[PDB]
Symmetry: C3
Subunit: 124 residues, 3 copies
């Protein structure tokens, strides 16, 4: 097994890694709308969702995975009313490949993020 680290996603600040590879599977940590330099994006819900996906792309690629090998995602959202907007952005990344998914509204996310996504992906 091994930890995944990339400078193209926010640094894992604390007792966790950006992700872990075990067997041929990559488990990401949940990604929020932080830039790699570590500050929150302050545009709309769609801009925040794009940043989450930028971070996911970076950790996936460092792990030898891609969006096309994601098997399962969990989407934590701050407001279920914003689901349609999050889903529009989400579908640009999972276009022809469509992972299993669950989406729920939590009480609160780290740094009061509007969206947080974790993924599990195959490493070919």
């Amino acid at each position: 097994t091994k930890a995944v680290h990339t400078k193209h996603a926010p640094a894992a600040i604390g007792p966790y890694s950006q992700g872990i590879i075990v067997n041929n599977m990559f488990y990401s940590s949940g990604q929020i709308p932080l830039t790699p330099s570590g500050e929150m994006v302050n545009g709309d819900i769609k801009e925040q969702t794009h940043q989450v996906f930028s971070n996911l792309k970076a950790v996936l690629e460092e792990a030898g995975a891609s969006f096309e090998t994601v098997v399962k995602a969990t989407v934590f959202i701050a407001d279920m009313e914003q689901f349609a907007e999050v889903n529009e952005v989400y579908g640009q990344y999972f276009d022809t490949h469509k992972p299993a998914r669950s989406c729920v509204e939590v009480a609160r996310l780290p740094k009061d993020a509007l969206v947080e996504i974790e993924v599990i992906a195959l490493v070919k």
Copy 2:
């Protein structure tokens, strides 16, 4: 990797699949009390939980899995006060085979569902 499709659960409309088979494992999307035709069930919490399990049964069986091969479930519930009733139905399906589980009360679910359950299962 293979997407799972069955007409006996609500259609995956949008950028996700009802479930995914990877290696010898099956990951479901979270199922809610939605009929295959796309109507929310408006009976009591037990009738609604039964619909969630009907949906899970359909996707599991299409994947070549069963309740008997489920290893992990996550139960997201709208109100923990209703968990005992959800658990009564849950325990009819997982009676002698007993998966790992985590259960939490969320702020809100898709379509304001009262409960959502996702599973991971072995494909023998």
Copy 3:
């Protein structure tokens, strides 16, 4: 595949197991701050989190896993304002190994627990 049973964590009471081994992987149930005798732990969030980790230690070791082989954790917290305290204790057990994780504030946990933690680990 095998259900995991240990007397050194609270008993799984009902239609679930403390964890499940499948292939070479271990899935825990979410652990809350109950003692093995079934009483909620006395004291502050740090004391509660220590109990959660004692429980995780017990189920991991019974499964032939350890904190060193945990690949992914999820931390469900009642109040994100208490996360610094939870994280301090978390870091004492995940010091030599830093799994992937997600941490979210939920509306409510079983038995009004302040924190619940689940893990997935490799069985060596």
